[PDB]
């Protein structure tokens, strides 16, 4: 089997970058809409006995993109592909990974079931919101990390990075930021939101020295940017010289762009798991780390039977 | 177990009509979108041990509505509903029921698989594009027919129906028109394209009634009506269960010679009816309500294939 | 993995022809019956790690042959074959592909489920009665077409084929005849019953060619031929991929006006050919052999949809 | 849900007896063959929400009867029966329950898989050849025993039963004969072949009773009876739950020294009884009827393992 | 169908308490071991058409108890029970709910799969280590919370409860403690915990004020008690007046009893999801909250089709 | 894909012997227990795209070892191994292969289901207690036989083997002893209990060889040996593939008249051999290594049923 790379309509630039890194052309596929807005898919070349990788991120018109991905997987599977891999850089419905005390769906599990029933044999994703989502599948899931790229960006783009502090915005971010700070051998600070009972103003609690220093918030995603904006205001109050935010998933929905433009961030850095050009047009402080080399290496290593976890710590 | 009816966002008015016919209130459910446009579903009441029916048609923003339906089914299933039934008046992706020479998905089969894995124990639908779609499922599927309501409309609205002709627009669905003509005891004239059309069956000085399962772009019925008017039919009617009316459909209907374009309300029609005066709607909420009630009570559903409740 | 071809008992000659075209011997298998008429299957050679193809058509004693096929698939699967493919030239129970108003099984879906649970990873078949049957499976299904061989036969056997007409016997399968007429660049005359038949398309002083997927009792083609001869066609031919010819079929063909009834050899025809002089057979073993070879080698199978190998 | 009993074509008289014992009429079903010998099934009454029992034994044309059973199960399942139970008095392919050194199917497992995928929720059977077959299913399987009826027959028909001997024909099934001898408080003499046979247990001047699960060709019981008569047994009886009697069985029984060959009516016996005077039948319809009634009512089925109803 | 409660060998006292609250006798079942130490199970009464509840906790000889539960489920399923429910107060292998950056199993997913294939139709458990484990199943899972009983105990046992801090010892507990701090209307604090090796705690960071106030560490389980002992040390160093520890699952393996006896806790409160009598014989400061009423009510409400989530906020 | 052999904790020496015969090192794996006694598994090397074999026998702390095996299979499966094979020399819960009259689990079927859901694509085992267990799986199962190694041991260790007798201890497994006697061309004397035992077959002044699949408490072989010594056998041997030897087994063997109790090393025997001088071990690591090598290379495994490698 040879590698065949197909792009969904969600992130064509990323698929092209990945295909270029692998020395391949993107596979021929028509992905459009019928008049009544049903997804139309037509695989334009034989995939019989091939190793097929479909690249589609959970962004934009999320339900349209997810349906398109499922339909493409099904089309490849009944076209007798030897193996079908969903390359989903930003996993959709990842934040609905549990019920809690609510009569709610576990939408991430439903997405996993849908991907499996469509025919996917392998999932490659980046920085799952909760790595327990790996257990929502029976097929193997390769959960890559943007951390090596993040460390590279910090070391090349921040002059005081040896004296910076890596800040977690919420309680759930402390593990990622501690891993980053351990790799950088720098201090870290932790932030979380206090109880919604001091009705005068919502209060952030910060532990760890940041005064007269460069502070770097790190998180998995910024959707409405409430989290990072609150954390950045807290950090500015505590005397940090400059504030950066680094995120793998730049969703930037709702008021995110206005909030960022009005915030004190020196830079908001995201990976390109989601297309960012349109958002960068409206926000001068968004910078993008390319992760297409990580994805290309993951695809190539899965195809060749090489170790993918080598990419957890080594920039290709 | 009691009946609980939940509405998706696609067709709220139909769900309300069904609930009124059953003497029930619609179940409390929040169906909206998160900021990033992911579907958010919250079941506002316990469904534990209940017989849940979720009403969602394959119309409008079809992918959003299908995702919403699947998410609602999943929420009800993991909330320990005794049984979950998807009431899908217009089945999405029904026209992608085969490959036939192309490297294409069988999207209808994928939709059936997704409904099954979401947890649906039962499907109720109306006038499937291909009844072979029933075989795409391993759970029972009740495929209702609009034909009794169509026959009622014909008898109460077309004064010359005893002399009329029932015309299939494409050769594929002529089975429907033969059944209707047999019920009415009339001739079934047939039409198919060769940019020219060929028609068998005397239509001169008569009323012709086109019958089909759906009108999407109305290319099919407008061409057939042009042919029929070429052959001297006094009036031409079109009757369809699913009024999708996407793309240029409203303009084509406005510029066509139809006396009336009758559709069922498996799909909401008010917006289309605003822009097109010749669209009339047959309410099929009684048929769906009766199907729900009969499946719940263990009564015969196939009795509805020939009886207006 | 190497190709291993095994024959069921239904169509030994076809399996041998396929094996010769592939340069292979048929795999050693004992397929017989115990005293109480239960199927006995014994794989006479290791299939461990091999690409196994089992050839069995849905003909003759259909239930025995289907059971034999399932038992052979199971034996090969638990003997650690790398892949098992059912080569089913005529798919059994294909005409029971829907319910449509009756409390009936969807037997084709049941057969698909049984083939899947027996362990088939892949299906190769020819001219499925309804291509929606491909959606009854979750494994890939390659539905081959007899059309290239049919076109070759028409060009080499009917001197007036450029002026002929391609006639569908029932409205359902007119898609096949339109494809054939487009390939030949001729008119497609159509026929359907109203005990009377209606025909569109000039057939006078011409050759008419009936094309259909199968002839079981030949009621369908004999009625169509009677109609065509009413309208002055000089000769009438019937061409079918599946020559089932059950019941009164041979007598009806003998008493009908067909110049020729051409069938493929998806079903053995020698016994029927003994009693009917106008039956001719098109060998499709090259198409099946090429499909097997291309699936094994990862080559395009759809290339066969338009090319005679 | 109410009990609905449907009969396959294999054993109509047994199904009628079961239905009479339950105070029910047999459900309306058309079970016939199309012209090309494909099974045709039509459920003549709604089974929606009902507890359906389909009675079909693995006898006669076994592959046809098995296909018919699977098709009936599928029809009832997609007709929204609340539960479908296959009542299979003689389980087909039960003797192919293992491979053991040969490249052979495990046909019993395939049959179990097919019954499961057809939609059976429950299996009722009698004296499975190997009770490990219960583990071939993931659904519950109630394996009934003919032993209470056999003990009743022995006590009411053999005057010297207190002095008799219960003999296993092959070493495999001696468990059955030990259970029977323990119930009767008698000795269990054993027999196995080395073309010569070896017997342990005093049989001289006594009655010997061969007990086995089935007699197919009667090679097993005729050899055992020859041995027993060599050792001076005054009379020899054979008792079996399944009287298959295929091949040369009737002639061998006629030429053997059996005082009686008693079988249950898990398989119809009238035709065999016409040609063999020493065959007698034990009715087990009460046991099957009680099992059906107890599974329906949630009552203990295992109570039947030791009690004649 | 009637309720039939069967007990496994793990927590017989809990099963008896549950049966008493339901006005039922425990079902007749033999659960022992063959000579070669395979599990032997024999159901001593017909379960045909019944609603069967099997109570087995993930404690003691965990693999033995898990196999016994699976075998009991299988026996009941093939004895034609109308419904089989696994009542698992402490879910075994819950802490192996993800891979992270390791070639490790997701053992919790495996256990969910084995429960499903054995024939379980429904799971009742309490305070799952990660509620994403609910998504590991396709059958419904009722995850009950000890929180109502915990609130009862706090209000009836700590005099200064209106002026206390609720402290999470790791991030996984944060939601829990915040909920509790909401109900009591008090302050919370979060401790970020880093482990390098299994069963050992490496570093801790306290975020949130605890000075001059009673501290209530709240967590889901105490296995080796390294987490709560390190957390109590951190709280005292930060100036907590006194430290209580409240957990639902009292595993108390390894050095746990020794560490607790040498620690500074006013009390270590656990529920009886795991049997505690032996541990209490050697450790004076362990108190037990009975949760058998919650479990019995959940069983009764699932049987009767009543609301189970009503128990998330209401002690019966 | 390359062969990777991983050892569970049950039988490390056997796994090492297998790995040496294949010219491989054991794969790096950490298999230990957390503080609360939950199994901890860590695969120390990439298995992506490799053919993984996990060696674990159903012995010792059986539930711990079975859990460890399932957890290892799961870890290898989600680490993208191309294929995972469980090499289980002694299959756990094999004796619970049926219910038979009791409200009991079929634990062997549960174990098969658990192995399948954990992700095993293939099972290799030796002398299953009941070969019907192969039908408990849907994946291929290669059931190897110790018989070639047993025959080799008999020929090289019993000087009078041409005159010896092969004795089955229970009627159930006499098939094994008939196969062995046929291979050796000797008589197969049989034994079964009625607290008394009955024996057929001249054993006087001869060597008797008891052959069975396993010895757990040795109640079965000690009773049989007592019977044989009653009938004048000069020496009595016991040969078993699985030497479980639980409970009072070692004391019974020490107090019995066995010349030798020979077992294979499907279960570690050193500890038992310390306390019992008459236990001897046949190494079957060559058979398991050859089976692994042949499954990997697509070579015939059944060739090992009759050939010592
Ligand atoms: N939502 C859609 N809108 C428009 N075309 C669609 C849609 N879904 C599928 N199609 C395409 O429409 C075609 C199916 O057309 P249609 O159902 O009218 O005819 P058919 O299936 O060929 O024959 P018939 O229904 O007459 O037996 C296919 O090419 C299919 O890909
Ligand atoms: N083997 C068989 N022989 C004869 N009739 C059969 C067989 N199997 C099914 N049938 C019946 O034949 C009918 C199907 O007929 P047919 O396929 O010719 O037409 P259709 O499916 O209604 O329409 P079309 O194929 O023209 O779209 C059904 O009533 C079905 O029950
Ligand atoms: N319908 C059948 N008629 C005859 N023989 C059959 C049938 N089905 C399977 N067999 C064969 O019969 C043999 C099984 O024989 P049988 O059940 O009498 O003995 P066994 O399984 O070896 O041992 P036992 O039942 O005494 O423990 C196998 O070789 C099997 O292939
Ligand atoms: N690990 C075990 N140790 C001891 N007894 C067990 C074990 N597992 C199951 N059993 C019991 O042992 C019995 C099975 O015994 P055994 O396999 O010796 O004879 P059988 O299956 O009745 O007949 P045979 O094997 O001779 O055909 C059953 O009652 C079963 O519950
Ligand atoms: O063995 P002990 O020292 O008593 O520790 C037991 C801890 O293990 C779990 O924490 P985990 O490390 O899984 O972190 P999490 O709760 O944040 O997932 C659990 O939350 C307990 O705090
Ligand atoms: O609230 P938003 O800023 O829109 O979303 C970003 C954060 O919210 C979620 O918890 C994510 O994991 C991030 O931590
Ligand atoms: O009873 P034990 O001696 O412990 O177990 C050994 C025998 O018991 C079982 O039937 C085995 O197959 C052996 O024949
Ligand atoms: Mg977060
Ligand atoms: Mg149409
Ligand atoms: Mg036709
Ligand atoms: Mg026998
Ligand atoms: Mg924790
Ligand atoms: Mg034995």
Short mmCIF file of N, CA, C and O in Angstrom, two decimals, chain D residues 8-47:
data_model
loop_
_atom_site.label_atom_id
_atom_site.label_comp_id
_atom_site.label_asym_id
_atom_site.label_seq_id
_atom_site.Cartn_x
_atom_site.Cartn_y
_atom_site.Cartn_z
N UNK D 8 -42.94 -23.48 11.21
CA UNK D 8 -42.30 -23.69 9.94
C UNK D 8 -42.89 -24.89 9.24
O UNK D 8 -43.81 -25.55 9.73
N UNK D 9 -42.36 -25.19 8.06
CA UNK D 9 -42.90 -26.30 7.29
C UNK D 9 -42.36 -27.66 7.72
O UNK D 9 -42.90 -28.68 7.29
N UNK D 10 -41.32 -27.70 8.56
CA UNK D 10 -40.68 -28.98 8.87
C UNK D 10 -41.60 -29.90 9.66
O UNK D 10 -41.77 -31.07 9.30
N UNK D 11 -42.18 -29.41 10.76
CA UNK D 11 -42.93 -30.27 11.67
C UNK D 11 -44.23 -29.56 12.05
O UNK D 11 -44.36 -28.97 13.12
N UNK D 12 -45.23 -29.67 11.18
CA UNK D 12 -46.50 -28.99 11.41
C UNK D 12 -47.30 -29.64 12.54
O UNK D 12 -47.93 -28.93 13.32
N UNK D 13 -47.28 -30.96 12.61
CA UNK D 13 -48.07 -31.68 13.61
C UNK D 13 -47.57 -31.36 15.01
O UNK D 13 -48.37 -31.14 15.93
N UNK D 14 -46.25 -31.29 15.20
CA UNK D 14 -45.71 -30.93 16.50
C UNK D 14 -46.11 -29.52 16.90
O UNK D 14 -46.48 -29.27 18.06
N UNK D 15 -46.05 -28.57 15.96
CA UNK D 15 -46.44 -27.20 16.26
C UNK D 15 -47.91 -27.13 16.64
O UNK D 15 -48.29 -26.39 17.55
N UNK D 16 -48.76 -27.88 15.93
CA UNK D 16 -50.17 -27.90 16.28
C UNK D 16 -50.39 -28.47 17.67
O UNK D 16 -51.20 -27.94 18.44
N UNK D 17 -49.69 -29.56 18.01
CA UNK D 17 -49.83 -30.13 19.35
C UNK D 17 -49.41 -29.13 20.42
O UNK D 17 -50.09 -28.97 21.44
N UNK D 18 -48.31 -28.42 20.18
CA UNK D 18 -47.86 -27.40 21.12
C UNK D 18 -48.91 -26.31 21.26
O UNK D 18 -49.24 -25.88 22.37
N UNK D 19 -49.47 -25.86 20.14
CA UNK D 19 -50.47 -24.80 20.18
C UNK D 19 -51.72 -25.23 20.92
O UNK D 19 -52.30 -24.45 21.69
N UNK D 20 -52.18 -26.47 20.70
CA UNK D 20 -53.33 -26.97 21.45
C UNK D 20 -53.04 -27.01 22.94
O UNK D 20 -53.90 -26.64 23.75
N UNK D 21 -51.85 -27.46 23.33
CA UNK D 21 -51.56 -27.51 24.76
C UNK D 21 -51.53 -26.12 25.39
O UNK D 21 -51.81 -25.98 26.58
N UNK D 22 -51.22 -25.09 24.61
CA UNK D 22 -51.22 -23.73 25.11
C UNK D 22 -52.57 -23.04 24.97
O UNK D 22 -52.70 -21.89 25.39
N UNK D 23 -53.57 -23.71 24.40
CA UNK D 23 -54.84 -23.06 24.15
C UNK D 23 -54.77 -21.94 23.15
O UNK D 23 -55.39 -20.89 23.34
N UNK D 24 -54.01 -22.12 22.07
CA UNK D 24 -53.80 -21.09 21.07
C UNK D 24 -53.98 -21.68 19.68
O UNK D 24 -53.83 -22.88 19.46
N UNK D 25 -54.29 -20.81 18.73
CA UNK D 25 -54.22 -21.16 17.33
C UNK D 25 -52.85 -20.80 16.78
O UNK D 25 -52.21 -19.85 17.24
N UNK D 26 -52.40 -21.58 15.81
CA UNK D 26 -51.15 -21.26 15.13
C UNK D 26 -51.28 -19.93 14.40
O UNK D 26 -52.30 -19.64 13.78
N UNK D 27 -50.24 -19.11 14.49
CA UNK D 27 -50.25 -17.84 13.80
C UNK D 27 -50.33 -18.01 12.30
O UNK D 27 -49.81 -18.97 11.73
N UNK D 28 -51.00 -17.07 11.65
CA UNK D 28 -51.13 -17.11 10.20
C UNK D 28 -49.79 -16.77 9.55
O UNK D 28 -49.26 -15.67 9.74
N UNK D 29 -49.26 -17.71 8.79
CA UNK D 29 -48.02 -17.49 8.06
C UNK D 29 -48.09 -18.30 6.77
O UNK D 29 -48.57 -19.43 6.76
N UNK D 30 -47.64 -17.69 5.69
CA UNK D 30 -47.46 -18.37 4.41
C UNK D 30 -45.99 -18.69 4.28
O UNK D 30 -45.14 -17.79 4.29
N UNK D 31 -45.67 -19.98 4.19
CA UNK D 31 -44.29 -20.45 4.05
C UNK D 31 -44.25 -21.38 2.85
O UNK D 31 -44.65 -22.54 2.94
N UNK D 32 -43.78 -20.86 1.71
CA UNK D 32 -43.75 -21.64 0.48
C UNK D 32 -42.47 -21.35 -0.30
O UNK D 32 -41.52 -20.79 0.25
N UNK D 33 -42.43 -21.72 -1.56
CA UNK D 33 -41.27 -21.47 -2.40
C UNK D 33 -41.67 -20.70 -3.65
O UNK D 33 -42.69 -21.00 -4.26
N UNK D 34 -40.86 -19.71 -4.00
CA UNK D 34 -40.97 -19.09 -5.31
C UNK D 34 -40.63 -20.11 -6.40
O UNK D 34 -40.17 -21.22 -6.12
N UNK D 35 -40.85 -19.71 -7.65
CA UNK D 35 -40.60 -20.62 -8.76
C UNK D 35 -39.15 -21.09 -8.80
O UNK D 35 -38.88 -22.26 -9.05
N UNK D 36 -38.20 -20.19 -8.53
CA UNK D 36 -36.79 -20.54 -8.52
C UNK D 36 -36.34 -21.18 -7.21
O UNK D 36 -35.14 -21.27 -6.97
N UNK D 37 -37.28 -21.61 -6.36
CA UNK D 37 -37.03 -22.38 -5.14
C UNK D 37 -36.45 -21.54 -4.01
O UNK D 37 -35.91 -22.09 -3.05
N UNK D 38 -36.56 -20.22 -4.08
CA UNK D 38 -36.20 -19.39 -2.94
C UNK D 38 -37.36 -19.40 -1.95
O UNK D 38 -38.53 -19.43 -2.35
N UNK D 39 -37.04 -19.39 -0.67
CA UNK D 39 -38.08 -19.42 0.36
C UNK D 39 -38.89 -18.13 0.33
O UNK D 39 -38.33 -17.03 0.27
N UNK D 40 -40.21 -18.27 0.37
CA UNK D 40 -41.14 -17.16 0.46
C UNK D 40 -41.87 -17.24 1.79
O UNK D 40 -42.46 -18.27 2.12
N UNK D 41 -41.82 -16.16 2.56
CA UNK D 41 -42.43 -16.09 3.88
C UNK D 41 -43.28 -14.83 3.95
O UNK D 41 -42.84 -13.76 3.53
N UNK D 42 -44.49 -14.97 4.47
CA UNK D 42 -45.41 -13.85 4.62
C UNK D 42 -46.12 -14.00 5.95
O UNK D 42 -46.89 -14.95 6.13
N UNK D 43 -45.88 -13.09 6.88
CA UNK D 43 -46.55 -13.12 8.18
C UNK D 43 -47.95 -12.55 8.00
O UNK D 43 -48.11 -11.38 7.67
N UNK D 44 -48.96 -13.38 8.23
CA UNK D 44 -50.34 -13.03 7.97
C UNK D 44 -51.06 -12.26 9.05
O UNK D 44 -52.24 -11.98 8.90
N UNK D 45 -50.38 -11.93 10.14
CA UNK D 45 -50.99 -11.17 11.22
C UNK D 45 -49.92 -10.32 11.88
O UNK D 45 -48.74 -10.67 11.87
N UNK D 46 -50.34 -9.21 12.47
CA UNK D 46 -49.42 -8.35 13.18
C UNK D 46 -48.81 -9.09 14.36
O UNK D 46 -49.51 -9.77 15.11
N UNK D 47 -47.50 -8.99 14.51
CA UNK D 47 -46.80 -9.53 15.66
C UNK D 47 -46.19 -8.41 16.50
O UNK D 47 -45.38 -8.67 17.38
#
